[PDB]
Amino acid sequence: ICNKIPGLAPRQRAICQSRPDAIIVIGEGSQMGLDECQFQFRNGRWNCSALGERTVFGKELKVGSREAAFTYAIIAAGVAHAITAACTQGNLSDCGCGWKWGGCSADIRYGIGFAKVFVDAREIKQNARTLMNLHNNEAGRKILEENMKLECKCHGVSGSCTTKTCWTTLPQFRELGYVLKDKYNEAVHVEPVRASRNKRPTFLKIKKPLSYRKPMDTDLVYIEKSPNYCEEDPVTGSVGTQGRACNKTAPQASGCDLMCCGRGYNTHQYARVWQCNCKFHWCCYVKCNTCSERTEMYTCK
């Protein structure tokens, strides 16, 4: 059934045929990772979109730059987060579990163990790009593991901490997206390592001076220089900045002067509806009128 789904390795498709329901959740997680990447880079010249066909893991990057590192890290983190959250929601029944003796094993370990193997199974080939890819996926999983919130409650003799329980919770994915954005702002350059006997690269070490150590497992790692991303070029996968909106102001990466790479801006009276002034409840439908005055949206030429 899913043997035709684009962008999966043969082992990934075998796993898909094994358990249809896990694939739904993992696809939702990959989509969540891609959506978070696109929200984080909404104002950037590279809006986390690439020239290519749609896959479960989005359009793949033809250059191994910092953008690809962040994309793969967020994809892996989203997959693991979705697996764990679906397990805790009751959407997955085989997850975790035993129950009457030991209270069942942890959820996060199951989620990470499944997501690690499946996501890394896409790396069918072996190349410096592949080692970078595996490093970035592992970094995403490690950063997701770091951001788990630990909570404890005491329920001892009366309310005392004679006996207290501690449990971990998944971080809400926007916070993890911000953390991975911060990590992306400090990604490290690398080249692979090669020896006479092995004849192929096994691991990777830092390019940047003052050090030659292996990059830390929680660092986002990239091997290729980043293009300008505002010129349309299929050899590099850049979609170009043409047609994208801009704020026509000084702030970095948001102004038309920086968005359009010197080509200027085109504007028109857009007049957004901008519905406002509602009597909000804690959720759900409320009645209110709209206040659409005017706007002139500037877009790159």
Binding site: I5, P6, P20, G27, S30, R54
Partner: protein
């Protein structure tokens, strides 16, 4: 039973996929021709993010 799963694209966003659903399911009797017909019918590769294919894959277990 392909007919028993005809409800899956009531979740679909496009009416074109729904019309492709009804035409293929009441016109085709084999699953591989059915899936090729769907992908050529509303021009989208099977993706676990699409609610239509989500319903199809989920109901495949039932």
């Amino acid at each position: 039973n392909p007919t028993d799963s005809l409800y899956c694209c009531d979740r679909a966003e496009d009416h074109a996929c729904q019309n492709a659903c009804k035409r293929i399911l009441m016109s085709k009797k084999t699953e591989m021709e059915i899936v090729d017909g769907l992908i050529e019918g509303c021009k989208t590769q099977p993706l676990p993010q699409d609610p239509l294919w989500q319903c199809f894959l989920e109901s495949s277990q039932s």
